[PDB]
């Protein structure tokens, strides 16, 4: 069964601050029988990236193993590879974007070996949405159907493009890989087109890793930061976006940040609103406020 008879409404919250940023987050199981979301929130990365921050939401499916592994190691795989480093001083925008892509493919490969030797009924997968923030840029990262959104100058400034099986580029890859999109799902089952894990959808002979039925390749969009106008970023899984629009959620959060500076509370309000609107899925939201976010 996919659903409980009564929703599990308990919320897990976390918050922190540093590098001029403040964040809050909320996680809730809701009407689902299992809780398969995971998240990463870190201010200050190692080895010379102390001024950098990384936030991410992982929406797992068919188990929580891939999501949990991603939340514990995706950041390392991203920053430790040669592409991210780009042997010189600090990584260029291109280094960061290539490093993120290499991170996704490498953690996926690594996870494939470990799910092979220790065989079992853990054929899970997880989408990922997040932001790697540097002193000069915000790097939106998307792999799946969760979504990240940036509010700048009281407006929706950017939001990621959900990876749906029926979108043209996805359907193209799926058909080239010998699959099909039926009832909006890859081969009629998985309603996800990009994700880490889901190795059963990655065994197509003659096709590279980014050409499989399900792809681990992330979409990375760099945004030069604006100390004056950047207000906040919302990262949330489709349990939130399925029931609230970009403009609506942005306006809701911007309004709440005029009443309170409690980011966990604002995240709880977002989650509860979506639950009351009828969302029957797991829900995870991270709210990262910049120095010039709406103030209470």
């Amino acid at each position: 069964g996919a659903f409980l008879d009564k929703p599990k409404m308990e919320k897990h919250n976390a918050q922190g601050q540093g590098n001029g940023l403040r964040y809050g987050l909320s996680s809730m199981q809701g009407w689902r029988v299992e809780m398969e979301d995971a998240h990463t929130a870190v201010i200050g990365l190692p080895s010379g990236l102390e001024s950098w921050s990384f936030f991410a939401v992982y929406d797992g499916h068919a188990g929580s193993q891939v999501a949990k592994y991603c939340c514990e190691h995706l950041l390392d795989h991203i920053t430790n590879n040669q592409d991210f480093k780009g042997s010189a001083g600090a990584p260029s925008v291109e280094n960061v974007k290539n490093g993120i892509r290499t991170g996704f493919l490498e953690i996926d490969e690594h996870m494939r070996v470990m799910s092979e030797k220790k065989h079992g009924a853990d054929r899970s997968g997880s989408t990922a949405v997040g932001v790697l923030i540097s002193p000069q840029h915000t790097y939106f990262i998307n792999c799946g159907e969760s979504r990240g959104l940036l509010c700048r100058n009281r407006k929706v400034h950017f939001f990621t493009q959900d990876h749906k099986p029926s979108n043209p580029l996805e359907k193209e890859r799926i058909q080239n890989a010998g699959g099909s999109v039926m009832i909006q799902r890859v081969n009629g089952s998985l309603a996800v087109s990009r994700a880490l894990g889901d190795f059963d959808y990655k065994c197509v002979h003659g096709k590279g890793p980014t050409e499989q039925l399900v792809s681990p390749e992330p979409e990375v969009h760099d945004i030069e930061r604006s100390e004056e106008d950047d207000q906040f970023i919302i990262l949330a899984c489709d349990g939130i976006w399925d029931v609230m629009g970009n403009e609506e959620l942005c306006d809701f959060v911007r309004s709440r940040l005029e009443v309170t500076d409690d980011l966990e509370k604002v995240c709880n309000e977002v989650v509860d609103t979506c639950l009351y609107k009828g969302s029957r899925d797991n829900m995870s939201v991270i709210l990262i406020c910049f120095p010039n976010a709406p103030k209470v």
Partner: peptide, 6 residues
Amino acid sequence: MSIYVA
């Protein structure tokens, strides 16, 4: 949902 269809 991701796998459950209904």
